Scaffold this active site. Structure first.
Site, PDB file in Angstrom:
ATOM      1  N   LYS A   1       3.210   1.978  -5.065  1.00 31.57           N
ATOM      2  CA  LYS A   1       3.978   1.127  -6.162  1.00 31.57           C
ATOM      3  C   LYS A   1       3.037   1.184  -7.550  1.00 31.57           C
ATOM      4  O   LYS A   1       3.833   1.724  -8.408  1.00 31.57           O
ATOM      5  CB  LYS A   1       4.419  -0.336  -5.655  1.00 31.57           C
ATOM      6  CG  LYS A   1       5.464  -0.433  -4.727  1.00 31.57           C
ATOM      7  CD  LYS A   1       5.786  -2.152  -4.405  1.00 31.57           C
ATOM      8  CE  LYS A   1       4.420  -2.813  -3.871  1.00 31.57           C
ATOM      9  NZ  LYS A   1       3.879  -2.282  -2.663  1.00 31.57           N
TER      10      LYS A   1
ATOM     11  N   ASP B   1       0.915  -1.227  -0.030  1.00 27.75           N
ATOM     12  CA  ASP B   1       0.032  -0.072   0.113  1.00 27.75           C
ATOM     13  C   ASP B   1       0.601   1.419  -0.121  1.00 27.75           C
ATOM     14  O   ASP B   1       0.181   2.313   0.061  1.00 27.75           O
ATOM     15  CB  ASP B   1      -1.029  -0.040   1.234  1.00 27.75           C
ATOM     16  CG  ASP B   1      -2.571   0.244   0.732  1.00 27.75           C
ATOM     17  OD1 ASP B   1      -2.989  -0.507  -0.492  1.00 27.75           O
ATOM     18  OD2 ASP B   1      -2.881   1.061   1.225  1.00 27.75           O
TER      19      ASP B   1
HETATM   20  N1  LIG Z   1      -2.308  10.608  -0.179  1.00 32.68           N
HETATM   21  C1  LIG Z   1      -1.809   9.821  -1.205  1.00 32.68           C
HETATM   22  N2  LIG Z   1      -2.228   8.583  -1.380  1.00 32.68           N
HETATM   23  C2  LIG Z   1      -1.418   7.743  -2.266  1.00 32.68           C
HETATM   24  C3  LIG Z   1      -0.395   8.379  -2.974  1.00 32.68           C
HETATM   25  N3  LIG Z   1      -0.063   7.094  -3.730  1.00 32.68           N
HETATM   26  C4  LIG Z   1      -0.905   6.125  -3.384  1.00 32.68           C
HETATM   27  N4  LIG Z   1      -1.949   6.397  -2.375  1.00 32.68           N
HETATM   28  C5  LIG Z   1      -2.989   5.553  -1.986  1.00 32.68           C
HETATM   29  O1  LIG Z   1      -2.232   4.656  -1.525  1.00 32.68           O
HETATM   30  C6  LIG Z   1      -3.148   3.452  -1.551  1.00 32.68           C
HETATM   31  C7  LIG Z   1      -2.508   2.207  -2.256  1.00 32.68           C
HETATM   32  O2  LIG Z   1      -1.907   2.787  -3.528  1.00 32.68           O
HETATM   33  P1  LIG Z   1      -1.223   1.584  -4.184  1.00 32.68           P
HETATM   34  O3  LIG Z   1      -0.604   2.364  -5.706  1.00 32.68           O
HETATM   35  O4  LIG Z   1      -2.180   0.597  -4.659  1.00 32.68           O
HETATM   36  O5  LIG Z   1       0.025   1.060  -3.425  1.00 32.68           O
HETATM   37  P2  LIG Z   1       0.651  -0.297  -3.803  1.00 32.68           P
HETATM   38  O6  LIG Z   1       1.983  -0.305  -3.115  1.00 32.68           O
HETATM   39  O7  LIG Z   1       1.000  -0.490  -5.098  1.00 32.68           O
HETATM   40  N5  LIG Z   1      -0.034  -1.679  -3.125  1.00 32.68           N
HETATM   41  P3  LIG Z   1       0.335  -3.277  -3.119  1.00 32.68           P
HETATM   42  O8  LIG Z   1       1.355  -3.457  -2.227  1.00 32.68           O
HETATM   43  O9  LIG Z   1      -0.872  -3.985  -3.036  1.00 32.68           O
HETATM   44  O10 LIG Z   1       0.865  -3.303  -4.577  1.00 32.68           O
HETATM   45  C8  LIG Z   1      -4.413   3.761  -2.762  1.00 32.68           C
HETATM   46  O11 LIG Z   1      -5.477   4.109  -1.641  1.00 32.68           O
HETATM   47  C9  LIG Z   1      -3.763   5.059  -3.300  1.00 32.68           C
HETATM   48  O12 LIG Z   1      -4.662   5.734  -3.626  1.00 32.68           O
HETATM   49  C10 LIG Z   1       0.219   9.610  -2.994  1.00 32.68           C
HETATM   50  O13 LIG Z   1       0.787  10.023  -3.487  1.00 32.68           O
HETATM   51  N6  LIG Z   1      -0.740  10.303  -1.824  1.00 32.68           N
HETATM   52 MG   LIG Z   2       0.469  -2.359  -6.245  1.00 32.69          MG
END
Ligand SMILES: Nc1nc2c(ncn2[C@@H]2O[C@H](COP(=O)(O)OP(=O)(O)NP(=O)(O)O)[C@@H](O)[C@H]2O)c(=O)[nH]1
Ligand SMILES: [Mg+2]
Ligand SMILES: [Cl-]
Ligand SMILES: [N+]
Length: 403
Positions: free
Chosen positions: A22, A19
Site C-alpha cells: 500500500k 505488507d
Molecule cells: N518485489 C516487490 N516488493 C515490493 C513491491 N511493493 C512493495 N514491496 C515490498 O513489500 C514490503 C511492504 O511494502 P509496503 O509498501 O510497506 O506495504 P504496506 O502494504 O504499506 N504495509 P502495511 O500493511 O504495514 O502498511 C516492503 O519490503 C517493500 O519493499 C513490489 O512491487 N515488488
Molecule cells: Mg503501509
C-alpha cells in the site's frame, strides 16, 4: 500557498493486507503523477511511514494523506495500515474515501485483512473499488496471477462489490518507484512499470466517479484526527461530508463529550494550502480557536451549530459474521459490550436483545438495540461495523434512533 480549484476533487486511498504494498504504491503514485504535473510534490516511502513508531515497528500505523492529480482530477489519497492491530485506523481512513485501491500481493494472494478491509470499506460507505495486483515482478507463473485475480474478484462479490467488473491492474509499486527515483522525469510510455501505474491512474480517473455532493446542506465534517500546530493552535482534520466552512464561521464540536462545544474556525487548508472556502468532498484541516487537542478528538463531528443532535440509543439490523469470515466462533447475549464504528467514530456500546431472543449466533441476521456509553452523531440508514477483542464480529445499519 493558496489552493486553486481547476479540477474536480476525489478522495481515494489504499487498503489491503499487511505488507502487500500500500505505502510503496502511494509513493509511486506521487512520483509518477508528478512527472506530468509539476503541482504534484513527490512523497518518498519514508515521508509516508514517517512516525517514530512506524520506523520502530516496521509497518504503517497512522493513516497518511497525500496529494496528486491527473489531467482529469485532483486526488487526496489516504494510505491505511494493513496490520490486524491497526484496523481502527484503517476504518477511519476508509471513511474518507470516495473509492479505494485494494492492494493485493501477487505472491501471496488475498489474506485475512484483504477480506476484512473489503468488508469494513463497505461498512463506512466506500462506493467503488479498484484492485492493484502488486509484486508481479516476483511471480513468473501466469497461472498463479490469473488465480489470484479470480480469488480477489470472487471475494469482492461476497461483500456486494461488482467483483467481475472492477479493474484489476497488475504491476510493481516498487519497480515503478525505483524507476522514478533514477529518472523523476520519466514520462508515460517510456517505462514498463511506470506505465502500469498510469494504468492504475486511468482506472482511478474513469472507474471511480466523482460523488454527488451537497454544499447547500448544513456543514458537517467527521473529525479523523486532531493535532497541535506550534504557532497556530489546534487543527481538526477530516473529509467534509456536506456544506461549506469559511474562516470566521462558528462551528459546533459534536459527540463523545457530555455536551457540545462551540468555537470559531480560524483557518482552513487542504494539503497545507489555504482554502478560501472548504466544501463538501474537500480533505481539510480546520483550525479551531480556543480549544486544545485534549478538547477535540477523532470521532467527533464539526457541524453548523444546532444542526446535529448526538445520540446514545438506537435500533439496528445486524449481520453477525461466521467464523470463516473472521468473526467469532461463538455467539453473544444481552449485555455484550463490543465496539461500534460509525464513519470516523469508535465507541463502546451495550447490546440489548429483545425479550425471547436470548442469544445471537454467528451467521445470524438479527435486530437489536444498542446503547452507546457516549453520545455520537448518528442517523437512520447509517452503516456501522462491530468489533470486539481485536476482531470484526458484525456489520450493521441503524434502523431507528431511540434516543
Ligand atoms: N518485489 C516487490 N516488493 C515490493 C513491491 N511493493 C512493495 N514491496 C515490498 O513489500 C514490503 C511492504 O511494502 P509496503 O509498501 O510497506 O506495504 P504496506 O502494504 O504499506 N504495509 P502495511 O500493511 O504495514 O502498511 C516492503 O519490503 C517493500 O519493499 C513490489 O512491487 N515488488
Ligand atoms: Mg503501509
Ligand atoms: Cl488549517
Ligand atoms: N503512515
Amino acid at each position: 500557498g493558496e489552493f486553486v480549484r481547476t479540477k474536480p476533487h476525489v478522495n481515494v486511498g489504499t487498503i489491503g493486507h499487511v505488507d502487500h504494498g500500500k505505502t510503496t504504491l502511494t509513493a509511486a503514485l506521487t512520483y509518477v503523477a508528478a512527472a506530468e504535473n509539476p503541482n504534484v510534490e513527490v512523497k518518498d516511502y519514508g515521508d509516508i511511514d514517517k512516525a517514530p513508531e512506524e520506523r520502530a515497528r516496521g509497518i504503517t500505523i497512522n493513516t497518511a494523506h497525500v496529494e496528486y492529480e491527473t489531467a482529469k482530477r485532483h486526488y487526496s489519497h489516504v494510505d491505511c495500515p494493513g496490520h490486524a492491530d491497526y484496523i481502527k485506523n484503517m476504518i477511519t481512513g476508509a471513511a474518507q474515501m470516495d473509492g479505494a485501491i485494494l492492494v493485493v500481493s501477487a505472491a501471496d494472494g488475498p489474506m485475512p485483512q484483504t477480506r476484512e478491509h473489503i468488508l469494513l470499506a463497505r461498512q463506512v460507505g466506500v462506493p467503488y473499488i479498484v484492485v492493484f495486483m502488486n509484486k508481479v515482478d516476483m511471480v513468473d507463473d501466469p497461472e498463479l496471477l490469473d488465480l489470484v485475480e479470480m480469488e480477489v474478484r470472487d471475494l469482492l462479490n461476497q461483500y456486494e462489490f461488482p467483483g467481475d467488473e472492477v479493474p484489476v491492474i497488475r504491476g510493481s509499486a516498487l519497480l515503478a518507484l525505483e524507476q522514478m527515483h533514477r529518472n523523476p522525469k520519466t514520462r508515460r510510455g517510456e517505462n514498463e512499470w511506470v506505465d502500469k501505474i498510469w494504468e492504475l491512474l486511468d482506472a482511478i480517473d474513469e472507474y471511480i466517479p466523482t460523488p454527488v455532493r451537497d454544499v447547500d446542506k448544513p456543514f458537517l465534517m467527521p473529525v479523523e484526527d486532531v493535532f497541535t500546530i506550534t504557532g497556530r493552535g489546534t487543527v481538526a482534520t477530516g473529509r467534509i461530508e456536506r456544506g461549506k466552512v469559511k474562516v470566521g464561521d462558528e462551528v459546533e464540536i459534536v459527540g463523545l463529550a457530555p455536551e457540545t462545544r462551540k468555537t470559531v474556525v480560524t483557518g482552513v487548508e487542504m494539503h497545507r494550502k489555504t482554502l478560501q472556502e472548504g466544501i463538501a468532498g474537500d480533505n481539510v484541516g480546520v483550525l479551531l480557536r480556543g480549544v486544545s487537542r485534549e478538547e477535540v478528538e477523532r470521532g467527533q463531528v464539526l457541524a453548523k451549530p444546532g444542526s446535529i443532535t448526538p445520540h446514545t440509543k438506537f435500533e439496528a439490523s445486524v449481520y453477525v459474521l461466521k467464523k470463516e469470515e473472521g468473526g467469532r466462533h461463538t455467539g453473544f447475549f444481552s449485555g455484550y459490550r463490543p465496539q461500534f464504528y460509525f464513519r470516523t467514530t469508535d465507541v463502546t456500546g451495550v447490546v440489548q436483545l429483545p425479550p425471547g431472543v436470548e442469544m445471537v449466533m454467528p451467521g445470524d441476521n438479527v435486530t437489536f438495540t444498542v446503547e452507546l456509553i457516549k453520545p455520537v452523531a448518528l442517523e437512520e440508514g447509517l452503516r456501522f461495523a462491530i468489533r470486539e477483542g481485536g476482531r470484526t464480529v458484525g456489520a450493521g445499519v441503524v434502523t431507528k434512533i431511540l434516543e
